[PDB]
Amino acid sequence: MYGDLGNKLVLEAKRTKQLYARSNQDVNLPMYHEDIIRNILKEVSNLRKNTEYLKEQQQLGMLDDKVAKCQYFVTLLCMERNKRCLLAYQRLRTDILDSMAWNNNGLDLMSSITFSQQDTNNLSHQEQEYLKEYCDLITDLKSGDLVDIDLSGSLVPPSDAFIDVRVLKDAGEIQTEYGVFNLIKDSQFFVQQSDVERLIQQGYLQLI
């Protein structure tokens, strides 16, 4: 009853791992809960308020009682508990997030971060600032190499090395890089793994 709201919150955190697990991974997190954590923050503010109040009270009334220690001990733990929840949730949220910023940006010619992450505005803007700052953070890693990378792509090794891509209602032709593949619905291109990696992440290509 004392610290249990955090147990319920992480209990809810678990569900998103369930949705990232088997899964299938489309992202589409329901929302970031600002309300329930606001409840948590009001509860914890309550706590630390009574804490400094009693911290004033030992200075006068309690007179360093053996019992007093407990309040600064036990209730202190509760602060930690909320923290233990609040970060555990939060890191989970960054884990479901940064990976998404990894596997797709997105990808050639990134060329900008847009239309991605169906959560969009529904997810908190505090995370989105972190996010845009994070893909800005990875742009520098993109700028050190000189591989070339394409780090974002090709998690799965090339074979061999030409494939066949079947158009999937995409228009097209937007293939400007390397060559004008001239995208055309209902058209399969007997194209090398090279531009396939880049174009498959977008949603144009279908069968590898």
Partner: protein, 221 residues
């Protein structure tokens, strides 16, 4: 110094990396001569591909071969570093505590890449900055610092040296460490008596007992 050897060591590093529970030294001496080498052949193949059209009013094979090869090896390191950056993402705090302490070897220019160090500090920074305007406002006075309380704990974890890793024992015999009956190495676990180790057979154990064998590359993972 041979290319093939740098590659075998690249693969070796890659496997040892994805296996072990924790981070390994950043091998710049090699990885940089490969980061120069690929910049060379990627320019070279585009040059020979462009010069090829001049004899055209034959065989695309060595070009296709070459290019496929380059796709393979440009995959390898990209897995490597895309992995290490993850372990940095998990160990950022631990590494920080490892940096503030004197002993023994901190990040420097060695333990992490000159590229990786940026990733580390910036990620760390923007992470602290995220959690700062998110849940610490509203900031507990004892919890101001991110570090051990202790308990529980936090992180600290996870330099976990006891985790199990499949290991396959390989290395040149002098006939150093071979005590018989078959061969090297010791072993001497702290909790248990030696097995000890046989070289033609893979033996799963803790990462800590074998870390020195790992350093010597006397056992593959």
């Amino acid at each position: 110094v041979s290319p093939q050897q740098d590659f075998s060591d690249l693969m070796k590093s890659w496997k040892n990396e994805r296996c072990s529970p924790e981070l390994l030294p950043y091998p710049h001496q090699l990885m940089k001569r490969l980061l120069n080498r690929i910049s060379m052949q990627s320019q070279l193949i585009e040059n020979i591909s462009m010069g090829f059209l001049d004899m055209q009013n034959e065989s695309k094979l060595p070009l296709l071969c070459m290019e496929t090869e380059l796709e393979r090896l440009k995959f390898v390191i990209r897995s490597y570093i895309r992995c290490r950056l993850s372990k940095i993402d998990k160990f950022s705090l631990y590494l920080r505590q490892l940096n503030e302490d004197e002993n023994s070897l901190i990040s420097l220019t060695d333990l992490l890449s000159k590229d990786e160090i940026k990733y580390h500090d910036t990620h760390s920074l923007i992470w602290l900055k995220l959690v700062n305007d998110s849940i610490l406002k509203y900031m507990p006075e004892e919890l101001q610092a991110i570090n051990d309380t202790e308990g529980s704990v936090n992180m600290i974890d996870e330099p976990d040296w006891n985790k199990f890793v499949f290991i396959h024992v390989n290395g040149p015999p002098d006939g150093e460490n071979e005590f018989g009956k078959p061969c090297y190495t010791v072993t001497i676990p702290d909790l248990k008596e030696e097995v000890e180790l046989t070289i033609g057979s893979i033996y799963v154990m803790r990462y800590e007992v074998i870390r020195d064998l790992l350093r010597d590359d006397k056992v593959a993972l």
